[PDB]
């Protein structure tokens, strides 16, 4: 019964093995602990928004949306309808990005490595969408606690439609490479099986629940924005292993395509941030012509808006699971406390029980099926 | 509404079992994957010929910072310190005093590019379009010191890139 | 896509589907890089009367 230290995204793993079997597996984290939560207390709410881009850096606008929803709830305001539709559209695009990354990185770690390139071409196209709407490819800072920063450019919807109508064939090529392959099935079937009750007690969420047959999805049970106005299906697993979770992720990619089609067809007209200049900055022309607009611009960009005192826990169905924020306001323009809840934290904490009685080569598969990014785990 | 991803039970009819046995013994799905890779070999690759070909960008793109001026050549910055106040990374350092003609101007305007997160909050906080994020992104450096920009460097960047900067601002200002 | 008929048939038969129908490379069907100016409407609080801030 020897000990192995598989050290240096970046993870240290201390495990005891007897022969080939894994007897114990303790992850050591903190190699990407940046002290985000302490840094946020020294910023205004707008200044704190861009940290959520860097929390889970495969799904940026989803973290943006969660933070914005928390601040909106504390502010007792609501975004305009068009902003909500834009938010849900880009949230589904972000879900597509995250699921591509998760599945192709899983396959590459197993050894496939061709679908990685095949689908990172599509990832580059969606990065183009991000850049055209915000000017940045990944760290976008587009979704604000009053709506969105800017309206869409005049030809963006057409190009999103053109992209989304060919993506199903790319998913089909992915499935042709992976779904029915006997080597992939032997690497994934009956690996990392977790029961429903254990998954509930261990704090799992998202696919890690739905793979075990739990019928739960935050966009269906606790809808935010315009989600209750779109229809889609929730894929549900049956054996609670890596193979069922992979199938669930592919099906969620397809359902994201469905939701994106609906969002494209029902995009409404109007403004894109809340018409309340004490929260959302005025337009540049108004700022340069009106006294109140100039004053409110000055104060919003120097002091920031004050948030009434109180505490909220706001959670969303991020592509990796339930992503939450416990936000405490003391009445000023800077948050008093911001605790970030990342699903990968609980998933990595459950890695030890998920890898009991398995081979060393199965720990990589379990890590890939947990969909871990250490930016959100360490914060 | 929910769907089952893996809830199908295989047929027990002799034909289904023989088809599964043929799949096991003759490796039909492996041949199918090989055919997929073969078909992908014969389609045109997505590679562009950098640096002779470039990646498409938008007028909203955030690149290297620049300081602008009016058509008269007088600088737009009037040292309000709004960009310094809003900078999430505290990357802007500003010092100001009355000029020899009584004008409100800066004597120090520094941006530490190794602290900057390129969020563009400074250009949207500016009331006179003085500080902007330009279109240039190919400004890698061999030392850490050359990435600490002072006012002369930013004014030189503005004078270098003003044509493209003005065209981009003209293209995008009706959304701002 | 400028691929010969024989190459198109070979890639279609190896893939098992029609590839020319859904190409992963983009062509003139994307929107132009120069667009007309937008107009960008205003929000509901842009009234000249009956618009006191204490009511909103």
């Amino acid at each position: 019964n020897l000990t192995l230290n598989f050290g240096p995204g970046v993870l240290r793993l201390v495990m005891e093995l007897s022969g080939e079997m894994v007897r114990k597996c303790d992850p050591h984290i903190g190699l990407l602990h940046r002290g985000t939560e302490k840094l946020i207390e020294y910023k205004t709410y707008l200044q704190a928004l861009p940290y959520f881009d860097r929390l889970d850096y495969v799904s940026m606008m989803c973290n943006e949306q969660a933070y914005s929803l928390a601040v909106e709830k504390l502010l007792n305001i609501q975004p305009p309808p068009r902003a909500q539709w834009i938010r849900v559209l880009f949230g589904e695009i972000t879900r597509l990005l995250n699921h591509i990354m998760a599945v192709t990185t899983h396959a590459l770690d197993i050894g496939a490595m061709t679908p990685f390139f095949w689908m990172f071409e599509e990832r580059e196209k969606m990065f183009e969408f991000y850049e055209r709407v915000s000017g940045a490819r990944m760290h976008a800072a587009y979704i604000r606690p009053g709506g969105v920063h800017q309206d869409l450019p005049l030809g963006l919807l057409d190009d999103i439609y053109e992209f989304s109508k060919n993506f199903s064939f790319r998913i089909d090529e992915l499935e042709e490479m992976l779904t029915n392959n006997r080597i992939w099935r032997n690497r994934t079937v009956d690996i990392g099986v977790v029961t429903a009750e254990d998954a509930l007690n261990y704090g799992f969420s998202g696919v890690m629940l739905r793979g075990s047959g739990i019928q739960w999805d935050l966009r269906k049970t606790q809808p935010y924005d315009v989600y209750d106005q779109v229809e889609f299906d929730v894929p549900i697993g049956s054996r609670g292993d890596c193979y069922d979770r992979y199938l669930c992720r592919v099906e969620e990619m397809r359902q994201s395509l469905r939701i994106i089609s609906q969002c494209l067809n029902k995009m409404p007209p109007g403004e894109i941030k809340v018409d309340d200049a004490k929260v959302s900055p005025p337009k540049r022309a108004e700022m340069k012509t009106s006294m109140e607009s100039l004053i409110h611009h000055f104060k919003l960009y120097t002091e920031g808006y004050q948030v009434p005192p109180g505490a909220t826990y706001t959670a969303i169905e991020a592509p990796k699971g339930e992503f939450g924020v416990y936000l405490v306001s003391d009445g000023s323009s800077r948050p008093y406390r911001c605790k970030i809840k990342a699903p990968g934290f609980a998933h990595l904490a459950g890695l030890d029980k998920m890898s009991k009685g398995h081979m060393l080569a199965d720990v990589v598969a379990i890590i890939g099926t947990q969909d871990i990014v250490f930016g959100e785990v360490d914060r | 509404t929910y769907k089952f991803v893996n809830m199908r039970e295989p047929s027990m009819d002799m034909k289904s079992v023989t088809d599964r046995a043929a799949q096991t013994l003759l490796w039909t799905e492996l041949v199918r994957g090989l055919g997929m890779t073969l078909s992908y070999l014969f389609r045109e690759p997505a590679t562009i010929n950098y640096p002779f070909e470039k990646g498409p960008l938008s007028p909203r793109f955030r690149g290297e910072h620049a300081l602008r001026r009016y058509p008269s050549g007088e600088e737009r910055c009037i040292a309000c310190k709004l960009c310094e106040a809003v900078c999430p990374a505290q990357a802007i350092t500003i010092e100001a005093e009355p000029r020899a003609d009584g004008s409100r101007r800066t004597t120090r305007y520094d941006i530490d590019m190794t602290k900057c997160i390129y969020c563009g909050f400074c250009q949207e906080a500016c009331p006179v379009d003085a500080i902007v994020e330009g279109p240039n992104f190919e400004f890698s450096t061999e030392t850490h010191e050359e990435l600490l920009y002072n006012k002369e460097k930013l004014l030189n960047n503005g004078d270098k890139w003003e044509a493209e900067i003005a065209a981009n601002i003209q293209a995008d200002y009706l959304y701002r | 896509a400028s691929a010969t008929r024989v190459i198109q048939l070979l890639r279609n038969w190896a893939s098992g589907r029609d590839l020319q129908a859904k190409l992963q490379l983009r062509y003139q069907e994307i929107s132009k890089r120069t667009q007309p100016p937008p107009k960008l409407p205003v929000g509901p609080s842009h009234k000249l009367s009956n618009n006191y801030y204490c009511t909103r």
Binding site: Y161, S168, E175, R258, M267 | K15 | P37, P38
Partner: peptide
């Protein structure tokens, strides 16, 4: 004079977007 102009879907909407899994059976017993 000028009316509102912003990025909108075309009149009549967009064409149907395929999303269902399509893995055909080539065919040989």
């Amino acid at each position: 004079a000028s009316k509102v102009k912003q990025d909108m879907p075309p009149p009549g909407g967009y064409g149907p977007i395929d999303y269902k899994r399509n893995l055909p059976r080539r065919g040989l017993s």
